[PDB]
Design a protein. Structure first.
Lengths: 135, 135
């Protein structure tokens, strides 16, 4: 493992995954890339509600990603923010960064999800080329 | 990770998982435990067919586990064989060995299973306390 990607949504699951990812990168001497994906504000919202929500959404998204960066100690350039569905985003980042391992919580927040697997972890386990470390 | 457990069923998935597990143990300086579970011969088989099948079943099971041992280089005492359902067995071995990480193929052979996840990996992801590395 030369490049490890951590999917971080801010949940306790993600916090535990962050601790695992940090240890993993240190053990393999790999570069750790952290990623947080956020949902775009619904276009059905009218003015000025849409604009206000847009600003807040981005601030909170950046806030969550900063927490991940503080937890892992990675440089700002290795802390990525993607707009859209987390799974689509993780897979997207994994390819662009040529990741060799994806570390993520078995469960998380968002759209669907069950007590078994989050919808996002399910999509990653289903479509990721590289190994997936579920925590 | 101090103790890593590799579930090995002999499939190509398992062979790739073995390579990952070996690297993982070396990176963390952890003890690697390999496990292979085999299904008990159906009691409905009459004599002497049941007895003949019993002997062959065990020989092949030991043969598969030996391959895993040759792949990982672990000592004989750290190569375990369990009779029963692989998932039940992996979880059983994980507890007894106080494993901190389970490494296994996303898919495998046996009872159920889909192109998404093998029935065994699904049970492990659903009930294992420790992180699961899906390869």
């Amino acid at each position: 493992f030369k490049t490890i990607l951590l999917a971080y949504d801010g949940s306790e699951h993600a916090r535990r995954a962050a601790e695992v990812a940090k240890a993993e990168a240190e053990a393999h001497g790999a570069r750790l890339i952290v990623v947080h994906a956020y949902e775009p504000v619904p276009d059905y919202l009218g003015e000025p509600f849409f604009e206000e929500a847009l600003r807040r959404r981005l601030e909170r998204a950046e806030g969550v990603l900063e927490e991940a960066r503080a937890l892992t100690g990675v440089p700002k350039e290795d802390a990525l923010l993607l707009e859209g569905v987390p799974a689509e985003a993780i897979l997207q980042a994994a390819r662009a960064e040529k990741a060799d391992l994806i570390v993520m919580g078995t469960r998380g927040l968002g759209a669907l999800g069950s007590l078994f697997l989050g919808s996002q972890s399910q999509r990653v386990v289903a479509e990721a080329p590289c190994p997936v470390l579920l925590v």
